[PDB]
Amino acid sequence: NVQSRGLGVAVRNANDGISMAQTAEGAMKETTNILQRMRDLSLQSANGSNSKAD
Amino acid sequence: NVQSRGLGVAVRNANDGISMAQTAEGAMKETTNILQRMRDLSLQSANGSNSKAD
Numbered sequence: 001n002v003q004s005r006g007l008g009v010a011v012r013n014a015n016d017g018i019s020m021a022q023t024a025e026g027a028m029k030e031t032t033n034i035l036q037r038m039r040d041l042s043l044q045s046a047n048g049s050n051s052k053a054d
Numbered sequence: 055n056v057q058s059r060g061l062g063v064a065v066r067n068a069n070d071g072i073s074m075a076q077t078a079e080g081a082m083k084e085t086t087n088i089l090q091r092m093r094d095l096s097l098q099s100a101n102g103s104n105s106k107a108d
Contacts (some may be wrong), residue, residue, distance in 0.1 A: 005094045016103035 098108070
């Protein structure tokens with residue numbers, strides 16, 4: 001009975017861990033997409049055609 | 055006759071001993087009922103998921 005109840009809260013605890021992991025993974029994509037945008041536009045700026053104002 | 059009456063109060067005697075045995079047992083099941091509740095929520099609070107306020 002102790003083990004059965006302990007497992008009942010154990011799956012709850014791992015559900016909390018899986019929820020925290022995916023919520024950090026949600027902010028993971030927002031960061032990765034922003035980083036990709038900087039890299040893409042850095043190549044755009046690296047071209048010598050545009051002037052300093054651009 | 056002495057033995058017969060002595061046994062008669064002896065059945066009453068051991069029945070009283072039985073009665074206090076079950077009264078203690080009645081508080082026994084409730085005592086372990088709280089202890090199981092303590093242990094289960096201690097498992098719940100052992101995660102890093104909850105903060106200090108929880």
